[model samples]
Target: ADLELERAADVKWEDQAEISGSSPILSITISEDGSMSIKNEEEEDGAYRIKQKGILGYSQIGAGVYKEGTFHTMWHVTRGAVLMHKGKRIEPSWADVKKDLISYGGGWKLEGEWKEGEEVQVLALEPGKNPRAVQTKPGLFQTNAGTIGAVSLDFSPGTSGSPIIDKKGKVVGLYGNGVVTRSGAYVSAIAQTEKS
Candidate 1:
């Protein structure tokens, strides 16, 4: 899917004026290949939010019709998954950077000096269903599961929001939202990053 933005007056649809707000805006388009493009009407400053119209499937309801104000964090500059340097597949544990370097895959082992603030992108799946159960007490209720594809992030904040990247610096997922235990850290997975 691709995102495109135009001036409110330039929107082709007649209802756009009624729907869009004065905030700098953009439009998202999803192509047949599942690629997305985002275009902005005007340059924005600071961190802002964008809402994409959802698709309605038989089982999955579209975000546009089911409700309003549903927000999903999306990549602003680029979107896609990270690729392995060659065809190497690292073990899930390899994701733990704190661990020692171990070579297992037939592909070349990725070794380098990575600094902070480097950018990468990732693909993630936001589940439409919520597992959170309503509780009368404040005790912990059931938890939910979310997936993150190899997305990009600066090697800061520990692993939270860290961007998973390919050797080429492409983003494959954004590190976030994993299984959480009261005492343990959240275990998460990567989503297939969307192709640009």
Candidate 2:
């Protein structure tokens, strides 16, 4: 049988002139209702520059969930600045990390949390370990009869401690790695340690 999964649309882009330039740069304010606010730095044109997937633009800043029941929000830090978040930051425990991996499969492991410099491995028990084997989507796994191989992220020099978040905005892993590519650069997180 064949397996299938759906891909979601990426964030939309907007022009830089749309932002209000009078907001704060960072809002660490939490409401009594258990809600929180964060701010982003603004640009000179009364807009904030949010860098994602190789695109930057000016956008309106406000607070609201990106998806239903999700905490993702974009808000202004200063009059023209904006920032986004899927959820509040939290320190993860070993159990938290294990849970993230177990949701995918029992064979997954954790290298370490953000900036901790740990390594995790998945066992490939099959006879032929083909590094060229095709992989499933971002969150899927493959079981090779007796062995297992994983799609993993190794934290390195520049990315010693970045946050790994889930669709719901929860922190699941730490970022590590300093590699750059023509497309751009990013830190990798040990997925099993991230919040699902």
Candidate 3:
């Protein structure tokens, strides 16, 4: 579990020195591996990146993940891009912190996994204290088997890279677009992230 989720004012897109805004990353997800997928297109040369509340300097979603939909944004985590949380420099790979969230990428879903038509919670930032669990809008997709992959959740404006939690307490995904309408959610299976 190489993660410590929080809401960022805005996640910037770096390249040619661009506070570049993407306050609402459209489609974000973190798999069991140390990798992730996010939607922030413009320039993939993202040699370096930054955010208001997460990792700093040349941030990345690590290796083995990608983005889909409109812009085809790029994703990567250079060997030099380190991470810190709760004021300590911890290595997620070494199982220093929340290791369950980033368990071995064996698709075990350890504590939790994605599920449709179930109640879920949102753990967001409120400042001066730890995060509180709140309910996300309760609803499910058509799950028609043919279009189940067409289901997704819309994230809150500032909670860009937050985690999506299901009923039994599991990290469903790393939320990106927490503001989707019934007609336009990503609709892809959350497990789709496991492939890469």
Candidate 4:
């Protein structure tokens, strides 16, 4: 319960002006200078970017067929900006989205392996964008070739692409389409995003 509140507060409202969609944002220290990095699921079809098959964006890992005709999306640092904090909307600067990735790589992991009976929490938002902590269990979800790591959460409208965090406040996965045990991108996938 205590950690949930801490993780919940870490999530911020992302105002991606490129598509202008408010994706849930997770912050991390990616640079040695203390610059904060932002991570979120790739927004496909719902934003200005055109929808097609075979890798939506630069980020390599996402929930889908893994390689063939995948739908799980990814985002570059330049495509998003944080506009709110702690449930309050705040002005955002371009630097917010332009921060670097975790310098040591300890910030995230991509094992895609969820142990049995392991409960995880996602910083999901209400349909109206109110931040809420959703409790869920991590396990193998349906995938094309192999079982993928995911959580079975009732994804409300805005909850899609929410960050699934582990006990240490490290993002574990990301929520995507398919409400029935929707799949998500591992938090470590953010490291794969184009660092431009």
In order, the Cα lDDT scores of the candidates are 0.23, 0.23, 0.31, 0.34
TM-score of each: 0.20, 0.20, 0.36, 0.38
Q: In candidate 1, what are the lDDT values of residues 21-138, reduced to their tens digit? A: 1122233457776754354222211112112223632121111000011111222211221212123322211122221111111221222222233423221111222111110111
List candidate 4 stretches off by more than 4 Å.
Answer: 1-8, 11-114, 179-196
Candidate 3: list runs displaced more than 4 Å: 1-80, 85-111, 126-130, 137-158, 178-182, 185-196
Of candidate 2, the 10-residue stretch with the lowest lDDT total is: 123-132
Question: How close to the true structure is residue 41 of candidate 3, measured as C-alpha lDDT?
Answer: 30
lDDT of 3 by residue, 74-191 (tens): 1212122234435544332311122112212123222345555554544332222223344544444443233322224343333333444455544454433223434665432332
Q: Comparing candidate 3 with candidate 4, which one achieves the higher TM-score?
A: 4
Instruction: State candidate 3's TM-score.
Output: 0.36
List clashing residue pairs in candidate 4. 30-101, 42-73, 42-74, 174-184
Every candidate's CA RMSD: 17.1, 19.3, 15.3, 16.0
Q: Candidates ranked by TM-score, best first?
A: 4, 3, 2, 1
True-vs-predicted CA distance for residue 158, candidate 3, Å = 4.3
Cα distance off (Å), candidate 4, residue 8: 8.5
Best by TM-score: 4
Q: Assess candidate 1 and give its TM-score to the true structure.
A: 0.20
Give one digit per residue, the lDDT tens place, for model 4 in 139-159. 565444344555545554434
Better of 1 and 4 by lDDT: 4
Task: Identify the leading candidate in terms of lDDT.
Answer: 4
> Candidate 4: global Cα-lDDT?
0.34
Output the lDDT of residue 186, model 2. Answer: 30
For all candidates, the clash counts are: 38, 28, 16, 4
